């Protein structure tokens, strides 16, 4: 690739997920557009479940520093992702680093282990 920032970009191999401090401007299927989104994923394999829970990871969606209350089916199309520490506009890169991961949310901001 080109001369990107790529300095806090780490790859967690335990839950197949990139971690670097970016912000999202996502748009759903037909619901609305949101500003300054970021994800936080938490790896909790020892968890008191229901009779329907199946995942080791759980995702909190954050919208402005406050938690998004999910009310719809969550389609994400990253209209514009932007880097925060270096202010570059990392938009097309996070598109093509996402199909070759084949996980639900490939880029997050932090990953918490065993909660």
């Amino acid at each position: 690739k080109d001369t990107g920032a790529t300095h806090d970009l780490v790859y967690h191999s335990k839950i197949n997920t990139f971690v670097w401090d970016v912000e999202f401007d996502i748009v759903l299927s037909d619901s609305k557009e949101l500003n300054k989104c970021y994800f936080v994923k938490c790896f909790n394999p020892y968890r008191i479940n229901g009779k329907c829970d199946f995942a080791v990871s759980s995702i909190d969606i954050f919208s402005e520093g406050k938690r998004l209350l999910i009310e719809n089916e969550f389609n994400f199309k990253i209209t514009k992702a932007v880097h925060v520490a270096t202010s570059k506009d990392v938009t097309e890169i996070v598109l093509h680093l996402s199909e070759r991961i084949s996980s639900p949310f490939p880029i997050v901001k932090e990953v918490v282990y065993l909660d």
Binding site: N44, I48, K51, A55, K66, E73, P104
Partner: protein
């Protein structure tokens, strides 16, 4: 340098070109009648030496050494954290100038650094004419070390502001800050030893190191002979105790603590002394883990009847609580097995934990606190209630810890998610009896009663919320009714909309008349209401009226399937709900038979509902990194998918070396 006084209490000749007097002195101590031949004045000088060497633990010679136990006792109220007895001591009338020396250290340990600066400045005035400079020289060291504490606090108070300390100011007046800067201008601690009287420098040359910038430089380099020269010691084999490099490093830790706490030196609160305790306790646990695993290769797995070689006690508990951060305890928990470290003296570890619970109660069930005491104490109260996983607690002692952890521990340090992580750790060696459930059931009520405000949301950095406390109650007492939560949900209307959404997560805790009226706001009509109804809503059931909407969304996706291929759109960026449905089928919670007639849409769906008719060259091996202990056990249940995914795990543990694919393959698939 005439003798070695080794850490066992024994004496070895080193360079005594002269008369052997320490060899002779213990010949007087052994005999009872030969010492009744000495002088008059020079016989009470024997009782004073016999008390000194017994109090400091110099026992006998090393050529005539016995088999005697040398246990550690630190007699200090500031080591044990007896904060309320330290405060009763500060409010008593000082007889001596040695009692003001001990008060000035207890003031520093209690965080009130202004009173301690002034009380050391008082002692220096009253102790120049003293004929020994120990109260004078050490008050000049401790006054300068507590000046380094004030200057580094007023930096970090203005680095955080109000978001961390919670007081929105700094606890030092400028009449105190600009005073002590004038009093400490060009105060060189180096010229302190070389500017004291000549009789001080001969008599007390051993106190010279406290004026240095960094001591403990020799003890850190002696940690190299601890953990990683036993690479070569196991070629011939290392053993148990025997004053091995294990015991020498541990007893020199216990001498450096007992020196610095019984002589009330404030250099015991610095980063260089905290890193020394970290670097030397972490490296004694890595050594005992190494010697355990090598003794399972050469000897057998049952030849070591003990759990592990490193046996902790009360003083090892307090040194990890006071000196380690939580990112440093987590390094021990991966680089050892503290389930294999047996903790002794658990009636003393309990009396230390109840006592941290008493101080967290007193600091924050009150309008009175320091921000200087709170910054150093809350790192120890966090590390001690975190490390209490490994301790059996009594029922009346655990109940005082759970009340201080759930109600009185400040949210600036432990949010709602980190309290659950540390409450769940207390239920491993213990469990939840019927008395500790009633504290959580008073926590959910106090969190229910706070969510009636329209501008309140829980802030949690782990992803764990009030949902998860309720899952912990039901994991132990499967039949439980919260009579105060089941009296706030049927005294409930649509006037408060947020508390409707709070108590959606707490449905298996409520009663039948409660679940009657709280299900009066659950409108499941679209499949958008299905998934949060099953994930978040806790429906805990599958009616055919539930599954009928699933078939409809399946069939419309099958209606979308004929335009899935004719339009060329194949991207599902979490547009699925579909890998989720086959997992519900495979777990035997969807009792349809007509599901398998829809198995052509998603590859992950095609695996869970049609195992036998599946093309395993379409398997994405990363799917097993999203499946939990529940679902991975069921894939080792199915006789059709067991032998296939072993070959996809073996091609990922041979080609890469991923320690998660190996952890799956061993704990479930063999």
């Amino acid at each position: 340098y005439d003798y070695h006084f080794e850490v066992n209490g024994t004496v070895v000749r080193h360079k005594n070109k002269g008369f052997g007097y320490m060899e002779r002195f213990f010949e007087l101590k052994e005999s009872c009648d030969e010492r009744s031949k000495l002088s008059k004045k020079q016989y009470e000088r024997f009782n004073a030496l016999f008390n000194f060497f017994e109090k400091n633990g110099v026992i006998c010679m090393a050529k005539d050494a016995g088999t005697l136990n040398t246990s550690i006792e630190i007699n200090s109220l500031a080591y044990h954290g007896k904060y309320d007895v330290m405060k009763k001591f500060i409010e008593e009338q000082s007889v001596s100038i040695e009692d003001d020396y001990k008060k000035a250290f207890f003031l520093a340990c209690l965080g009130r650094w202004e009173e301690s600066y002034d009380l050391y400045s008082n002692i220096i005035l009253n102790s120049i004419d003293e004929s020994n400079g120990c109260v004078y020289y050490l008050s000049q060291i401790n006054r300068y070390r507590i000046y380094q504490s004030i200057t580094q606090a007023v930096t970090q108070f203005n680095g955080l502001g109000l978001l961390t300390f919670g007081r929105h100011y700094k606890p030092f007046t400028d009449e105190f800050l600009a005073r002590i800067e004038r009093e400490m201008t060009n105060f060189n601690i180096d010229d302190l030893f070389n500017g004291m009287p000549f009789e001080f420098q001969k008599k007390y040359k051993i106190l010279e190191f406290l004026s240095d910038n960094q001591f403990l430089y020799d003890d850190t380099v002696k940690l190299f002979e601890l953990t990683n020269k036993v690479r070569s010691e196991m070629s011939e084999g290392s053993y148990s105790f025997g004053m091995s490099s294990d015991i020498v490093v541990l007893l020199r830790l216990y001498d450096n603590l007992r020196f610095l706490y019984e002589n009330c030196l404030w250099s015991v609160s610095f980063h260089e002394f905290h890193q020394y305790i970290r670097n030397s306790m972490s490296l004694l646990i890595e050594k005992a883990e190494y010697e355990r695993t090598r003794d399972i290769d050469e000897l057998g797995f049952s030849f070591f009847g003990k759990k592990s070689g490193f046996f902790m006690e009360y003083y090892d508990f307090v040194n990890i609580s006071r000196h380690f951060k939580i990112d440093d305890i987590k390094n021990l928990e991966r680089s050892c097995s503290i389930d294999k470290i047996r903790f002794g003296e658990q009636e003393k570890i309990e009396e230390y934990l109840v006592g941290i619970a008493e101080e967290i109660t007193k600091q924050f069930s009150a309008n009175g606190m320091n921000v200087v005491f709170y910054t150093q104490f809350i790192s120890e109260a966090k590390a001690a209630l975190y490390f209490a996983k490994y301790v059996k607690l009594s029922e009346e002692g655990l109940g005082k810890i759970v009340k201080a952890l759930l109600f009185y521990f400040p949210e600036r340090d432990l949010d709602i998610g980190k309290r659950y992580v540390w409450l769940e750790r207390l239920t491993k060696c213990n469990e939840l009896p019927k008395s500790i459930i009633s504290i959580i059931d008073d926590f959910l009520v106090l969190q229910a009663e706070k969510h009636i405000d329209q501008n309140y949301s829980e802030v949690s950095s782990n992803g764990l919320y009030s949902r998860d406390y309720g899952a912990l109650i039901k994991h132990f007492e499967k039949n439980f009714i919260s009579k105060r939560l089941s009296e706030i949900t049927l005294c409930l209307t649509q006037d408060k909309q947020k508390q409707i959404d709070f108590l959606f997560k707490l449905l298996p805790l409520l009663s039948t008349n409660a679940k009657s009226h709280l299900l009066s706001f659950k409108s499941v009509e679209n499949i958008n209401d299905l998934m949060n109804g099953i994930r978040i809503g806790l429906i805990d059931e599958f009616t055919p009226e539930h599954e009928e909407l699933i078939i409809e969304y399946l069939e419309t996706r099958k209606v979308n399937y004929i335009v899935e291929k004719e339009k060329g759109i194949q991207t599902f960026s979490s547009n699925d709900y579909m890998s989720t449905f086959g997992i519900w089928y495979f777990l035997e919670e969807i009792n349809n038979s007509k599901m398998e007639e829809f198995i052509g849409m998603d590859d992950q769906y095609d695996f869970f509902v049609d195992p036998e008719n599946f093309d395993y060259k379409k398997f994405i091996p990363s799917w097993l990194k999203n499946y939990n202990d529940k679902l991975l056990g069921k894939i080792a249940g199915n006789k059709h998918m067991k032998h296939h995914v072993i070959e996809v795990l073996k091609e990922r543990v041979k080609n890469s070396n991923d320690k998660r694919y190996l952890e799956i393959l061993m704990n479930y698939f063999i």
